Design a protein around this ligand. Structure first.
Ligand SMILES: COc1ccc(-c2ccn(C[C@@H](O)CN3CCOCC3)n2)cc1OC1CCCC1
Ligand SMILES: COc1ccc(-c2ccn(C[C@@H](O)CN3CCOCC3)n2)cc1OC1CCCC1
Ligand SMILES: [Mg+2]
Ligand SMILES: [Mg+2]
Ligand SMILES: [Mg+2]
Ligand SMILES: [Mg+2]
Ligand SMILES: [Zn+2]
Ligand SMILES: [Zn+2]
Lengths: 324, 322
């Protein structure tokens, strides 16, 4: 119906993912993954039974928390679809194998599963069972990976059942490498290396990037999924505003639990004292734009429109903050 | 009775740790930890109730598997006692705080807890729940930490209850840093960095090391406990021989599991095709001597005897190849 019409934009930056969420009965991750797997012919390439795929996807989506305002199945679907668009960037044409493509998309789908709506630092500071299990290191991201893989064991859920042993081992490694790179504490190191990769990048005559080993390849996929994870401010304003509403609700819910515990309230988590405009401008200035201008460098000029939107959105949000 | 005369060597390399296990009713970890904590006055410094210490130690010791030949409570006791000795080396006098000493000793005591007697690679290859939990990375070592800390939560087991919040945080970070560094897959990187530290080491007039910050201190502690973990071949030969017998028994049991599942048998785990003595010599040549020669460099000349014993023991296994 209308849904099929909205899913026509699946290859475009700015897909109305919230509409798809409404229209699909709160199943945007399932419907968007299915569409992209069909679009990329992934079922045939990897002999994935369509019943298996949908079963796994619905279980996966089920394990995103409905009551978590940002880190839910809509965010998962958004990162999946954004990664799907970045994979098709002309600078990367025929660079990645189907398995590498499958790894990047699967990693995006699972990358925040079972997210509790609080940060790693909160989990560490409250002596959580999760932090105890993971020794305070990439606590959430390790857990997302564990849950995402573990769900493959449920009945008729093994979508990788017809991969070779070699393929499965390789996919598992890449997926781990990619989701661990979504840990924000690794952002500055990822960025510093991505900048150096750009400085020395090699291209064919056709202008596609030359990535001739695993380290270079996985580094590009890591930063690709990281960009997609941090892509909200690069989206049309009507979408970006909705993401901003959700993250601040999630942050203030964490702030409320911190205040109740007599804890220092984390930056941007105090509903009484935070400023949304200032918060987003700082986010863009110190995190999102430095990352995206570096990606844009890597794939120039593929991402110029994305970078333009980001810069317009930054200009917009700063316009109501009084300045000298 | 006789346990007390053996415990007099708790300050010595080559403590009769197997004797201690027998004489203590297979409580070598509890006995040795209690002795060290009393010796270093750690109960008073950190206000650790003695019953709480003993209760935690007994529970920790119970979570080392009695049916695992090498990675059991005797190995934990050995690495604890060996770290205790390394910490007292003259070149390290007054270098570490009591909290750093506590962290090294606690890390040593928990560093292989709940070890199942199979390798990280075996756990990964067999798609174990543990490898699934830890995404194939430092699977055992992450697990040893989780268990060692979790046991603090059992009744009357929180030996850190009277540390400040900041002290707990700092100790927790150090213990994690140390135990994750015992993952053998990190040996080459750890050693490479230890060589770098030796090349640029700063000592006072009396040859005491001058560490400048957390990075320096934690690096020395990481390598110290790694040395203690890999100290078997530097011990008096009779100790070394028993340790070799035990690790081969545990390796062989893993190979039996691999063979039974139709897997490639891991290096040195095939009881039908082993060269125990040749393998100990290769172990020393490629892993243990390069590490201990580098440690000996750092604390020169404190570890000269240890190095000499290593080289003697190398010749024992060499002259013992059929
Ligand atoms: C739609 O907007 C967002 C979507 C995803 C996130 C997000 C993921 C992880 N973080 C948290 C910090 O690790 C990074 N911070 C950020 C701002 O200052 C610098 C260091 N944030 C944030 C968004 O913005 C928040 C608005 C209040 C602050 C950020
Ligand atoms: C007394 O000698 C040893 C004392 C301790 C170790 C030791 C402790 C932990 N490890 C790591 C393994 O648990 C993991 N390995 C990975 C590859 O092979 C299978 C299992 N090894 C080894 C010793 O020697 C081995 C026998 C021949 C040389 C090596
Ligand atoms: Mg995340
Ligand atoms: Mg170990
Ligand atoms: Mg008290
Ligand atoms: Mg220094
Ligand atoms: Zn995310
Ligand atoms: Zn050990």
């Amino acid at each position: 119906d209308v849904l099929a019409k909205e899913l026509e934009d699946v290859n475009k930056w700015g897909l109305h993912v919230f509409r798809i969420a409404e229209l699909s009965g709160n199943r945007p991750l399932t419907v968007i993954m299915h569409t992209i797997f069909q679009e990329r012919d992934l079922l045939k390439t990897f002999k994935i039974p369509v019943d298996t795929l949908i079963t796994y996807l619905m279980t996966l989506e089920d394990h995103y928390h409905a009551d978590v305002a940002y880190h839910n199945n809509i965010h998962a679907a958004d990162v999946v679809q954004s990664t799907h668009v970045l994979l098709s960037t002309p600078a990367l044409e025929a660079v990645f194998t189907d398995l590498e493509i499958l790894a990047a998309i699967f990693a995006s789908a699972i990358h925040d599963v079972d997210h509790p709506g609080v940060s790693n630092q909160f989990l560490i500071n409250t002596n959580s069972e999760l932090a105890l299990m993971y020794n305070d290191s990439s606590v959430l991201e390790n857990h997302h990976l564990a849950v995402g893989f573990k769900l493959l064991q449920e009945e008729n859920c093994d979508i990788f059942q017809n991969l070779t042993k070699k393929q499965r081992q390789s996919l598992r490694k890449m997926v781990i490498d990619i989701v661990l790179a979504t840990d924000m504490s690794k952002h500055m190191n990822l960025l510093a290396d991505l900048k150096t990769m750009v400085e020395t990048k090699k291209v064919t005559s056709s202008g596609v990037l030359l990535l001739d080993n695993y380290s270079d390849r996985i580094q590009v996929l890591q930063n690709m999924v990281h960009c997609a994870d941090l892509s909200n401010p690069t989206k049309p304003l009507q979408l970006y505003r909705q993401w901003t509403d959700r993250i601040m609700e999630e942050f203030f819910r964490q702030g409320d639990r911190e205040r109740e515990r007599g804890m220092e309230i984390s930056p941007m988590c105090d509903k009484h004292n935070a400023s949304v405009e200032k918060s987003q401008v700082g986010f863009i200035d110190y995190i999102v734009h430095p990352l995206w201008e570096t990606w844009a460098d890597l794939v120039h000029p593929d991402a110029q429109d994305i970078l333009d939107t980001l810069e317009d959105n930054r200009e917009w949000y700063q316009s109501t903050i009084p300045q000298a």
